[PDB]
Design a protein around this ligand. Structure first.
Ligand code: CL
Ligand code: CL
Length: 162
């Protein structure tokens, strides 16, 4: 199991513009297009992103290209972030995947806001950090995915995904 297979399980693949769980315009593997209500604001963002006139539809290859950019952008953001970097460095390889998953989903700023949880992961107080992470809008909005991530942090294995 690797970060890519993990995010592919959590986000799915869709070759046509769609609305995310929050109601936003998305495409491919979790690639947020815009928070704007306009399908048109979305179609334009999409063509800017792909470099062609797509008319809301892309190929698998194109979805995977966007996915590779997003994962890379996610990793570089963590390593560039003064709150996230130290947590990441302190963690083992599996747990590192769990942090990248949250960042991809909620952005650097979002995750950086989970102050207490970050402090507990850094101290390797697993069960405690799992309990605190569950007290969030995130967990209440997408409980099945939150739980998977959270178990990954609690245990350090890929069990939730297997
Ligand atoms: Cl809560
Ligand atoms: Cl979910």
């Amino acid at each position: 199991m690797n970060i890519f297979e993990m995010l592919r399980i959590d986000e799915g693949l869709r070759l046509k513009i769609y609305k995310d769980t929050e109601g936003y315009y998305t495409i491919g593997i979790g690639h947020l297009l815009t928070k704007s209500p306009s399908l048109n604001a979305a179609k334009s963002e999409l063509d800017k992103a792909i470099g062609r006139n797509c008319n809301g539809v892309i190929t698998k290859d194109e979805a995977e290209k966007l996915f590779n950019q997003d994962v890379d952008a996610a990793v570089r953001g963590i390593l560039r972030n003064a709150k996230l970097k130290p947590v990441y460095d302190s963690l083992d390889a599996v747990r590192r995947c769990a942090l990248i998953n949250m960042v991809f989903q909620m952005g650097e700023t979002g995750v950086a806001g989970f102050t207490n949880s970050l402090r507990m992961l850094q101290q390797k107080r697993w069960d405690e950090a799992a309990d605190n992470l569950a007290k969030s809008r995130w967990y209440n909005q997408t409980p099945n995915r939150a739980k998977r991530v959270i178990t990954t942090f609690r245990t350090g294995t890929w069990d939730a995904y297997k």
